[PDB]
């Protein structure tokens, strides 16, 4: 006998069915489902429990899918891809509720607003950070940068948009000012992903310099906003936009890694305590199940791994 | 509520012990032993089971009266003398005692001769059982000493495992209190926007 | 053993009074942090010594008109 920690059927699961290189994956906030996609363009939905069967698959994308996030109420999935389009999928219907189309170059990264009106922040290789609204064809805000943007998030109040890119430094725009209120400086190479903390106080940002840097985005900080740096993961010559994600308890942080290992760090000490093998290629995305200590990781090896951990 | 955790509260010192009991001293200068603290125990029953005879045997040693002793001078048989031997009772005492002592010595001889056959073995047999008792008792002593040390370890393990989480939260808490008061001063500093609004109203 | 246990419990009880008083002082101090925003005496002894001294004759002898126990038994 051995210790168990989740309702998974086995302490790790191997999900097979993809043929494309899986570039993104996220859980539904209700914990019932996860959705995963990448170069196959098909978005695969999986149940979290039991046989974890691939109950649904959505086509419709025709350029590979960079990033994919659920809306907070789990009514819709927002996903974006290199077809220069942001597509919002109704979870009950499995159909494209909105197809935002004003980007001029590949859209790589997406983040829905947490509450209030449903807004979708997006960042692209045209250098624009754009916030779309479900109710209008035209976007609400377009913030233009000289250099391509490949990561985006709102803050928790959904009134500051944080975008990172080729600049390494970060264009953080405040939606009442339409100005950069501050920049976060420490990244020596491009920013492959940004994820907002559950409470919204912090963001982690992952970069091709092989570090994750934790930033305090609260309105007042008396000094430098850099809280800490995490290392151990690696970015290879593929230059992927390796993502990052928070644990819902905030005590743990994850990032994609080219060395096949699933990294977990302790937020305060920045030490590693989980280094989980099993992948055969670049782990492009990693996420925590929102209610249960299940780790999701999606890799360039065409495989999705579910596994349970002792989150302490 | 007593909430001491002696494996976590390691900063406690004998100098603090003196200080703490001084505070209890100033308490017990006024706080007095007035309640019956023993009401969870029964009333004692020092004369249970004893007979009316044994109660008197308790009373004499409660009085610290000396224990009475048998006169064993019969074994030495004090000699009579002719100036006292005029009474038959003296000779009837002496001679019958002399007959009785002859049998006590005779039974003593039989006992000693049997003791000379069997005491050397039965004493060795006794000592072997006594060694068995002692090694069993030392086995129990070793077992319980390990059990006592395990309870110390379990307490230390539980208290220190909680203790590190206390240390993390306490360090976190004082940082927030200092930060929140700073934000109170900052928000009242930004209330200098009244100066802008008055200037903006009366340009 | 019963004598020493009574003393031990007395000392522990007295210690709990100190714990309670100090625990409230700490709570008030931590509350202040958590919400931090920017001849009378001579007369009495004179009167008490008068009162307690006048008693001393009554303490030596009770009134002769005091109702007896055998009378109070017939209330």
């Amino acid at each position: 006998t051995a210790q168990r920690f989740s309702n998974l059927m086995a302490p790790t699961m191997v999900l097979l069915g993809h043929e494309g290189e899986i570039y993104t994956g996220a859980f539904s906030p209700d914990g019932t489902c996860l959705a995963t996609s990448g170069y196959d363009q098909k978005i695969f939905f999986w149940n979290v429990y039991g046989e974890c069967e691939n109950f649904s698959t959505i086509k419709g994308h025709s350029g590979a899918v960079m990033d994919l996030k659920f809306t907070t109420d789990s009514s819709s999935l927002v996903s974006c891809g290199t077809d220069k389009s942001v597509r919002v999928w109704d979870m009950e219907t499995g159909t494209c509720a909105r197809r935002f189309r004003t980007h001029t170059d590949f859209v790589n990264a997406v983040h829905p607003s947490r509450r209030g009106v449903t807004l979708v922040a997006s960042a692209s290789d045209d250098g624009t950070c754009r916030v779309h609204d479900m109710r209008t064809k035209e976007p609400v805000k377009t913030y233009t940068n000289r250099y391509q943007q490949t990561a985006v998030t709102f803050n928790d109040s959904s009134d500051q948009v944080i975008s990172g890119g080729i600049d390494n430094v970060l264009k953080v725009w405040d939606m009442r000012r339409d100005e950069i209120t501050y920049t976060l400086t420490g990244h020596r190479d491009t920013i492959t992903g940004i994820s907002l903390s559950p409470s919204g106080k912090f963001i982690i940002s992952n970069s091709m310099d092989c570090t994750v840097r934790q930033w305090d985005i609260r309105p007042f900080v008396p000094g430098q906003r850099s809280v800490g740096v995490f290392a151990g993961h690696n970015h290879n010559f593929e230059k992927n936009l390796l993502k990052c994600s928070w644990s819902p308890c905030e005590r743990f942080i994850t990032a994609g890694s080219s060395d096949r290992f699933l990294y977990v760090w302790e937020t305060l000490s920045k030490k590693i305590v989980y280094k989980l093998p099993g992948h055969m290629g670049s782990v492009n995305c990693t996420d925590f199940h929102p209610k249960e200590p299940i780790m999701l990781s999606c890799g360039s090896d065409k495989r999705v791994f579910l596994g349970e951990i002792d989150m302490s | 509520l007593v909430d001491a955790l002696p494996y976590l509260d390691t900063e406690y010192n004998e100098a603090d012990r003196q200080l703490a009991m001084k505070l209890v001293e100033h308490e017990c200068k006024t706080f007095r032993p007035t309640k019956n603290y023993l009401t969870h125990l029964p009333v004692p029953d020092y004369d249970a089971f004893l007979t009316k005879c044994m109660l008197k045997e308790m009373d004499r040693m409660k009085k610290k009266e000396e224990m009475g002793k048998l006169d064993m001078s019969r074994c030495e048989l004090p000699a009579p003398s002719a100036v006292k031997g005029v009474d038959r009772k003296l000779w009837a005492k002496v001679l019958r005692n002399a007959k009785a002592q002859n049998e006590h010595l005779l039974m003593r001889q039989i006992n000693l001769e049997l003791m000379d056959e069997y005491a050397a073995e039965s004493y060795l047999q006794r000592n072997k059982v006594m060694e068995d008792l002692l090694t069993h008792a030392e086995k129990e002593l070793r077992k319980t000493k390990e059990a006592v040390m395990e309870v110390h370890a379990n307490r230390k393990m539980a208290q220190l495992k909680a203790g590190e989480k206390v240390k993390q939260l306490e360090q976190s808490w004082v940082s927030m209190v200092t930060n929140n008061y700073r934000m109170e001063m900052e928000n009242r500093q930004i209330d200098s926007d009244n100066r802008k609004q008055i200037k903006a109203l009366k340009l | 053993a019963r004598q020493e246990l009574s003393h031990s419990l007395y000392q522990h009880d007295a210690a709990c009074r100190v714990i309670s008083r100090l625990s409230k002082e700490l709570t008030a101090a931590r509350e202040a942090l958590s919400t931090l925003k920017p001849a009378i005496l001579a007369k009495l002894e004179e009167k008490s010594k008068s009162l307690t001294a006048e008693r001393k004759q009554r303490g030596k002898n009770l009134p002769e008109g005091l109702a007896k126990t055998e009378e109070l038994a017939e209330l």
Binding site: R218, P219, F220 | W173, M176, N180, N187, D193 | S34
Partner: peptide, 30 residues
């Protein structure tokens, strides 16, 4: 621990209220 968790949580709600004030105030100064 229960004492400290309540003490921590009292400040966790206090700081969110104070930062909403700071955002409301600092967004008026701009």
């Amino acid at each position: 621990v229960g004492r400290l968790q309540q003490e921590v949580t009292t400040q966790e709600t206090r700081e969110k209220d104070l930062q909403k004030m700071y955002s409301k105030l600092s967004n008026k100064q701009w």
